[model samples]
Target: SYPFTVEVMPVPNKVVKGQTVEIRCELKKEGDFSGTLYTIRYFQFEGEGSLKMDNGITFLPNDRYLLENEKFRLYYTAAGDEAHNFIVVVEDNFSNSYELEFDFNN
Candidate 1:
């Protein structure tokens, strides 16, 4: 283990395109790991009459955001111009990980 745990706090739980979303995360435990954090991430957003799943990297860098297992926020851009869902995730140097999701519609 990286000697710590990452806890992604609950978010809006839902949002719309062109709308604003606030996300947060906090450390469940305290420790330090000087290593390259590996994150396995993706987003599953579904619109009316359409089913879509975005890898998150396609629009933004993959696993770039780091809360250091602390509280933080993630804003979503209204690019799809339609209703969407999101499943954001981040992993640490160890097998330990964290994630957040939303059921959004427009």
Candidate 2:
């Protein structure tokens, strides 16, 4: 069986320097009502900024985000840059994968 589809979006699309941005995501397999268990591998792909957890932990490229639910949240902050980008590669237990890109602009 193939994995579920991933829904992702940036909260408040407009980006502001030295401010907080939120990313919201959901994962659900088609025709299945159960929650999707997945892993999220995320990192900043461009610019001088950071992607982190709400608890203030910075995410590294080598970190693995083990998750058991369909809902996920992340915070992004740009120290002093006008442009920044990050990415999340998601994989489900069925070996299905999806990539999400987060880019900020004025």
Candidate 3:
């Protein structure tokens, strides 16, 4: 019964460097795993900037973000105008996961 789903929030069509672009991923009720600790991961396929959680915690290529609740909002503040292609992956202990990936530009 491993069916995990991630709901993504709205993304802006464009943004200039220094302006923070927001990305959010929420676990759907259909795949709900309440009261569980999730292993979080993310990366920048293209761009030069910083990635952080809503708690103001910055992240590296493989660590730095964790989710207790199934919902998370990530903030991306970049320093380029070439646009951004980023990906987010969330998985729980049971191996149920939702890789919420999208493209954003500025």
Candidate 4:
């Protein structure tokens, strides 16, 4: 079995209302790895236990919302006056998964 690691980092950690933020994901393998053999999927969730699933729209990877399919980065636009807190769940075909916490400074 191959060991892998996942990381999610938001560019310019500071965010404001009506602005967009890019969430980048980095996946690394421990040993020799290659080929496009992995499929990535992700969903967003908010506080109070609110979550979004596979709705083929927001849940699914879109070229507009999602920049890169290979890395599975997320492009989010802050709308409300809240803290813009959320969570992203990323998974691959190799049964590897990761949960990343996203918080915008707005």
Candidate 5:
């Protein structure tokens, strides 16, 4: 009740520009499995060597932020030659949350 765990699907270690990706998440309890509301509260990223939250952090595409049945999908477009880092925030109704991090390059 006090703590919960979330698992996000694996993302590509290396993605080229114009490629699209899908993201999904799963929630679990220590003992029993129950239903709860989970949402993608934030999604943003930046270039390499700088904090993704800073350096003019850019958000996900306007239409890509979606969550349904405890899962969501994101279509990312790499627009630069440098690496792009990412940070995603997911929250649940029980106040439990988690951060997902990954990166891709052009």
Candidate 6:
């Protein structure tokens, strides 16, 4: 199956410098509902011109089946950054895809 929709949620939306951050995600598939699993493989930033990927940043992926029995959670560390945003993506077992973006400023 392939992904049809994606959603991203973050706790304590406002984060301070040098503080720990937690992010959650939900992935949905479109078809026989054959469990599709995806990992948060990258972190990205919403730039003025285009979205860019931050290199060397590691993110841990977690999968859970609560909150409507079709949700997954991903927890990762956030750097003490400024005017930054995050991009969370989850894919299916068949190379299909889905993504969610979370933006934070100041």
Best by lDDT: 3
lDDT per residue as tens, model 5, 7-53: 76787777655555555556555556433665554444565332212
Of the two candidates 1 and 4, the one with more favorable lDDT, higher being better, is: 4
The per-candidate count of clashes, in order, stands at 4, 1, 1, 0, 0, 0
Query: How do all the candidates rank in terms of lDDT, highest first?
Result: 3, 2, 5, 4, 1, 6
**Residue 101 in candidate 1 has what lDDT?**
58
TM-score order, best first, reads 3, 2, 5, 4, 6, 1
lDDT of 4 by residue, 1-106 (tens): 2456566664665566667666667766656653234444444443222222222344443212322344545566666545656656544555664556666553
Pairs that collide in candidate 2 are 4-29
Cα TM-score per model: 0.52, 0.76, 0.82, 0.56, 0.60, 0.54
Candidate 4 lDDT trough over 10 residues, lowest sum: 47-56
Misplaced by over 4 Å in model 4 are 32-57, 60-69
User: Per-residue alpha-carbon lDDT of model 6 for 1-106, expressed as tens digits?
Assistant: 3436665564665554555455545565666755545444445554221222233233433332223335544443445556556555555565665656666554
For candidate 4, the clash count comes to 0
Whole-model lDDT, model 3 = 0.74
- Alpha-carbon shift of residue 104 in model 4 (angstroms): 1.5
Best by TM-score: 3
lDDT string, candidate 1, 1-106, tens digits: 2454455555554455556554444545446544355443545556422222222323243434443324444555555556677666656665666555566653
> Compared to the true structure, candidate 2 yields what TM-score?
0.76
lDDT of 2 by residue, 28-54 (tens): 677644335677778776666767764
TM-score of 5: 0.60
User: Could you give me the TM-score of model 4 versus the true structure?
Assistant: 0.56
The stretch of ten residues in a row with the least summed lDDT in candidate 1 is 48-57
Residues 8-101, model 3: lDDT tens digits: 8788877678988878778765644442667778878877778888877888877735686776788888788886777778777666767766
Write out the backbone clash pairs for model 5: none
